Design a protein around this ligand. Structure first.
Ligand code: CYC
Ligand code: CYC
Ligand code: CYC
Ligand code: CYC
Ligand code: CYC
Ligand code: CYC
Lengths: 162, 161, 161, 162, 162, 161
């Protein structure tokens, strides 16, 4: 999390954390209750969030469920819905950690190599997470949606580049 | 390395689960401990040289260790020993701040026992000095922060034994 | 590394001998197999990504290995696994072209088993995926080239076990 | 051989051999029968080839077999003839491999350090292999002599330079 | 000593010692008797030398034995006299070796880190060795004092300069 | 590394002692041996290549070692062997000059036996060549210097066995 990031920088420079770095840690740790509320709200509403998201996704990309499409047939479509729930879960990890690290190490490093190997269109994944974001943020307060949006945005940006 | 939050996240991730109530309770405990940990880190940073100096005076000075035949004899070895103690204090403070001992396994204890035994660095006397560091630190950061630092300083000692 | 010609030369050299009839017969066999080996190498190069993704689909996908707790879970590990399979195919193709497994000993298998066991990479599942690579490769390069590739893919598997 | 060389280059670049490199391998492997014919002709005629060569060598350099000469006396002279047969053998390896590698690894790397330590004149070895080449090529067809000459030339140039 | 110094340089350059380096070793080894006489004289007079030295030191720095001073109280003062005898002993090692190496490896590398950790003023140590030098050289012949002075000077300079 | 003087100093230092009479007697012995050691070092340096080639001629040439199957066969291995002997002579001369074997432990023998065993370098034949170096060297530097060199060449041999 935010804490380990500070510690790694300090260790790199053979030093204790600075007063500034410690103030940053202090500020992060007082925001815990909000992060937990967000994580539990998304977890509780997973099925509803994924359903709204997949409906919008396949309205935009019906060809994914047509013959020759990567999500053609029930087993493959259900595996897409499985992946959707996994990325929602990773977003809750990011919110709890206060940074992108748990999202990146589990779901982004190598993500293009993986989905290319599966013949799942990476631009389809960008579109998928975009409407996942819409569905999830819709169930949060304005304040909490603003806190949460950057974690979705990080996934979307990562999948758009390189 | 992981901090306390990443450790709980990883335990959930390897099961493919959202964090349950018990997991959230662990996070709440760590979040609530923030003031304790940050204050202690600030105090230790400001007093790091004094803590080591006082621990050495209590545990190693005027003993066989600093006389010829002892492993702290020669200014070169004396200074190397002090440097080790500086290390142990700094990394214990990292681990206390993180609420997790993983940085100790990864960056302190890895191959350390073998290094000391190859060089003839005495484990017993090292552990005594680290224990002295624990008690000096506790006298400055208080009882509650002292306990947390004690966990991670004890962790280093166990790893050497 | 050696190819099949250098291997026969070395067997003669260490005796201080010109190549005898039996040795020349080995060279003749290798020289005659040139068309087979070159064609197969071209086909595999052109189809290397397809061979690996089809092997993975047959042997690893939808199994415990790709779920939490399995060693291909996380995109980082998934991608690392694919990379290993790319390696195995490329080096088996080198060995097939050379008609000699020495490059496998020197550049693939050296310390590999220890590396996997330290990381927790499953040997059984890796061997299953390489075996799947053998069968997909055979479907493309034909029966005869398929047999040669099979020797060197099997060699890697035996080296892991 | 030619095949190993291509593979080492490909491995260095983390790639499969190119279409050009594969064509080169194909071309090499179809020339096998010629190389085997050359190797067997030189092997069969070793005694004759070495005898012609040593006769020319010691006509040019009688001092090598005079007192104080490195090849003075029967045991030493016979060891020179032994070396001669060994370099002829290495040339057959080179012809079969289609490159200088088996000659270099067995008979050229460290060759000057060795013969210096033995007090055998390296310019003497240059002259020796030169007339070995003459004797050997004389027993081959024009085509086969042209194929074989560069393997002798490689030895001669190596012992001359650096 | 001087000998190992030459050997380390030669080894670094993958060579035998030069005629010049060997001449230097020869010259060093013929001066052994003088070095032994100096070492035994300083050893024999240790108590006298340390007593003269400490008397001058604490005349200059009485604050070191006043309350709050690093040498306040008998146990601490006696440990200073102990250190004094140790540096005199290291000087005899330097004289015997013909260079500063035995002094540096035992008593100078890390010396500032050590005395800082002990709250012993390093400028006090500079002043201490300065009057140790005075006391020790006073018991040697003029020739032997000139031979010995550089070993004290090395300690003094080391403790002065960061 | 240490030379003979530093060795005696270290034995005193680790006891916190000035050098006593017995220690000074050791130094006197080394100081007096200066002319012997320096002259021998000059002679060996001037004749290093000749000493090695004569030792090889006595102990290794015309034997199984230089024929196919032997470890000196191929010009590359022949030259590598000569280089080893160059090393042994040079380092033995260092140790003779220093009157101390520590440079041999630190810079010659460290992991050497394992290296040779991994490569298939024959220990027996190596030791025979070093012993030949000892006798050739003694013929040039005389009886007394020859004895000193013999100590350090024998030391290398014992370290290989
Ligand atoms: C749904 C929004 C999109 C979609 C997805 C889809 N995915 C698969 C198959 C797999 N997905 C994974 C995913 C992961 N493994 C991981 O370690 C992680 C990180 C947490 C992820 C996200 C894997 C491994 C598979 C392969 C099968 C298996 O689970 O072993 C499919 C199946 C079909 C295919 O492979 O092509 C699909 C359809 N498809 C869409 O159209 C969406 C944009
Ligand atoms: C002091 C309490 C005791 C003591 C210590 C002492 N240690 C060494 C040498 C080493 N100590 C370390 C330790 C670490 N290096 C690291 O990077 C880390 C981790 C963050 C640690 C814990 C190491 C690597 C060394 C060897 C390399 C080096 O010196 O830097 C010495 C010197 C031994 C010598 O003679 O060289 C000593 C004296 N000795 C005591 O007697 C104490 C009880
Ligand atoms: C895929 C079939 C399975 C799998 C593999 C997997 N491998 C690693 C990590 C490594 N694999 C290699 C392999 C090689 N490196 C080489 O240079 C060569 C040779 C030419 C080989 C064969 C190595 C060195 C590693 C470690 C270093 C690295 O990652 O580059 C992993 C990652 C382990 C981790 O957590 O870091 C994995 C996942 N795992 C499976 O479950 C498959 C059955
Ligand atoms: C003959 C054309 C010339 C000549 C040669 C000559 N050589 C020797 C002795 C040795 N030659 C070798 C050679 C090799 N060892 C190898 O591994 C290889 C590589 C394949 C070679 C070529 C060796 C080892 C010896 C030493 C004895 C032994 O076999 O153990 C002699 C003997 C006398 C001497 O050493 O000086 C001679 C005379 N002399 C000529 O004049 C020719 C030009
Ligand atoms: C006397 C001229 C000065 C002085 C010295 C003084 N020293 C100490 C305590 C220690 N001194 C050492 C010294 C060494 N350890 C070594 O390995 C070497 C190298 C050969 C030395 C010189 C040590 C280890 C100690 C600590 C106690 C122990 O021996 O374990 C004191 C004691 C008080 C203090 O620590 O502050 C003093 C007073 N003080 C002066 O004023 C002089 C300039
Ligand atoms: C000659 C008497 C015998 C012989 C020797 C031989 N040695 C090697 C290879 C190596 N020898 C060394 C030795 C050293 N390297 C050092 O830096 C030092 C120390 C100062 C020593 C003593 C080493 C490291 C090697 C391996 C690395 C290298 O070659 O540089 C070989 C070559 C083995 C091969 O096939 O590569 C040989 C032939 N062999 C004999 O038969 C002799 C009796």
């Amino acid at each position: 999390s935010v804490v380990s990031q500070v510690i790694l920088q300090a260790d790199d420079q053979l030093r204790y954390p600075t007063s500034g770095e410690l103030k940053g840690i202090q500020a992060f740790l007082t925001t815990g209750a909000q992060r937990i509320r967000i994580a539990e709200t998304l977890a509780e509403n997973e099925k509803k969030i994924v359903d709204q998201a997949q409906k919008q996704l396949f309205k935009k990309h019906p060809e994914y469920r047509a013959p020759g499409g990567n999500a053609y047939g029930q087993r493959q479509y259900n595996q897409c819905l499985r992946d959707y729930g996994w990325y929602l879960r990773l977003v809750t990890y990011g919110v709890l950690a206060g940074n992108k690290e748990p999202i990146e190490t589990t779901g982004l490093i190598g993500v293009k190599e993986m989905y290319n190997s599966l013949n799942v269109p990476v631009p389809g994944m960008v579109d998928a997470v975009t409407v996942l974001k819409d569905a999830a943020l819709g169930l949060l307060s304005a304040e909490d949606a603003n806190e949460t949006a950057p974690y979705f945005d990080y996934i979307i940006q990562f999948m758009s580049h390189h | 390395m992981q901090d306390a939050i990443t450790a709980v996240i990883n335990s959930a991730d390897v099961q493919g689960k959202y964090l349950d109530g018990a997991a959230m309770d662990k996070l709440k405990s760590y979040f609530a401990s923030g003031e304790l940990r940050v204050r202690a880190a600030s105090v230790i940073s400001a007093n790091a040289a004094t803590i080591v100096k006082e621990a050495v005076a209590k545990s190693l000075l005027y003993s066989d260790v600093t006389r010829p035949g002892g492993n702290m004899y020669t200014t070169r070895r004396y200074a190397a020993c002090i440097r080790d103690l500086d290390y142990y204090l700094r990394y214990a403070t990292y681990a206390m701040l993180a609420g997790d001992a993983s940085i100790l396994d990864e960056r302190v204890l890895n191959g350390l026992k073998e290094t000391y035994n190859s060089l003839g660095v005495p484990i017993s006397s090292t552990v005594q000095a680290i224990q002295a560091i624990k008690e000096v630190t506790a006298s400055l950061v208080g009882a509650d922060a002292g306990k947390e630092m004690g966990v991670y300083l004890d962790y280093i000692c166990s790893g050497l034994s």
